[PDB]
From a paper:
Here we present the crystal structure of the [name] domain of human [name] at 2.24 Å resolution. To overcome this issue all residues that are potential substrates for glycosylation were changed to aspartates to exclude heterogeneity while maintaining negatively charged features of the protein region, thus partially mimicking the effect of glycosylation; this protein variant was named a non-glycosylated [name] (ngMAM) domain. The electron density maps allowed model building for residues 639–813 in chain A and 641–815 in chain B while the N-terminal region (residues 628–639), which contains four of the mutated residues that would be glycosylated in the WT protein, as well as the (His)6 C-terminal tag, was disordered. The crystal structure of the [name] domain of [name] comprises a variable N-terminal region that contains a short α helix connected through an extensive linker to a single β strand (βA), and an adjacent eight-stranded β barrel organized in a jellyroll topology, with the strands named B-I, followed by the short α-helical turn at the C terminus. In addition to the polypeptide chain, we were also able to identify two Ca2+ ions and a molecule of bicine associated with each of the [name] molecules within the asymmetric unit. The two Ca2+ binding sites are present in both [name] domain molecules within the asymmetric unit and stabilize the domain by bridging the residues from the N-terminal variable region to the first and the last strand of the jellyroll. In contrast to the meprin [name] domain (Arolas et al., 2012), which contains five cysteine residues in the [name] domain of [name], no intermolecular disulfide bond can be formed as the four cysteine side chains present form intramolecular disulfide bonds, thus eliminating cysteine-dependent oligomerization as a mechanism of [name] self-association.
Author numbering:
A (entry chain B): 642 to 815
B (entry chain A): 640 to 813
Write the structure that this text describes.
């Protein structure tokens, strides 16, 4: 199959919500919720209904949640990170992917970003996890929008693919 | 006129036991056909969607024969379109992949516009072909020439017209 890197996450199934080996960042005010949704317009039909969610809420506007991956095995190969996201609504918020390094000190490098409405359906995002001797973790950062309908969903984060490096990158269409 | 791609041209080849060529058709004058496979195991899969794809197996006994899949008519009188697709060609003798434009009757002819021969890499790659503006209408052909390889084959997936790529960006090394 593929090596057990501990990196992938579907966020479980109906009788089991999980963040796998990912962790909530303790430098920010909110965290991502794991939902099981078998109703309404945002669902995980392929994976028995579980995803993470950052609800738009004018009262929480501009606070962030950050989910932080295990350290990426980045030394021999690059990886293509794929994930799915759902950002419907004009004030749904902002989703950023960052690479967190340790060594000058701990700092974040912005590599992917989607601001506001992206469409009324799930979309595929991809980010190349470049080869690097300097070690890093991946961060999914949800910034709460002012809308009062919906929010940012993310699901099915994976490096289990054989996608060429040059074609990996799939930015947000805004 | 302007929504034709989603009427059978754009094709992911279905999902699970829904195996489909959308509105693409087998050329019947030719000996072999492409097959739709469901992603189960092995290194060739539509991993990111858990989806289907098309495949032309290498087989030394059919070396040099072709399977030909023929698109619906492209409406090209008013504009060019960027067609993107994915392909997987691993093995020195995996065969040859050709994209042709078959211009409409009378005075039908086939114009070759994209060809890959032999080993391209152990991973999915993205092809791009600019479907030029033309008064004479045409169909796109995906043509798989059987390699003499004993393992593997040419896989293709996720053919689409993407009108947000400009003509200069409708190209590899990009
Ligand atoms: Ca899921
Ligand atoms: Ca899913
Ligand atoms: Ca597919
Ligand atoms: Ca795919």
């Amino acid at each position: 199959e593929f090596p057990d890197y501990g990196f992938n996450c579907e966020f479980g199934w109906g009788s089991h919500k999980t963040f796998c080996h990912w962790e909530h960042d303790n430098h920010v005010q909110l965290k991502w919720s794991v939902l099981t949704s078998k109703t309404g317009p945002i669902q995980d039909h392929t994976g028995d209904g579980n995803f993470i969610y950052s609800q738009a809420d004018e009262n929480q506007k501009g606070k962030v949640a950050r989910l932080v991956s295990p350290v990426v095995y980045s030394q021999n190969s690059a990886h293509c990170m794929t994930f799915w996201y759902h950002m419907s609504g004009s004030h749904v918020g902002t989703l950023r992917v960052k690479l967190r390094y340790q060594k000058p000190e701990e700092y974040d490098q912005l590599v992917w970003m989607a601001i506001g409405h992206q469409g009324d359906h799930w979309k595929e995002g991809r980010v190349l996890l470049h080869k690097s001797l300097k070690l890093y973790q991946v961060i999914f950062e949800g910034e709460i929008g002012k809308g009062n309908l919906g929010g940012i969903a993310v699901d099915d984060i994976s490096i289990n693919n054989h996608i060429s490096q040059e074609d990996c990158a799939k930015p947000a269409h805004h």
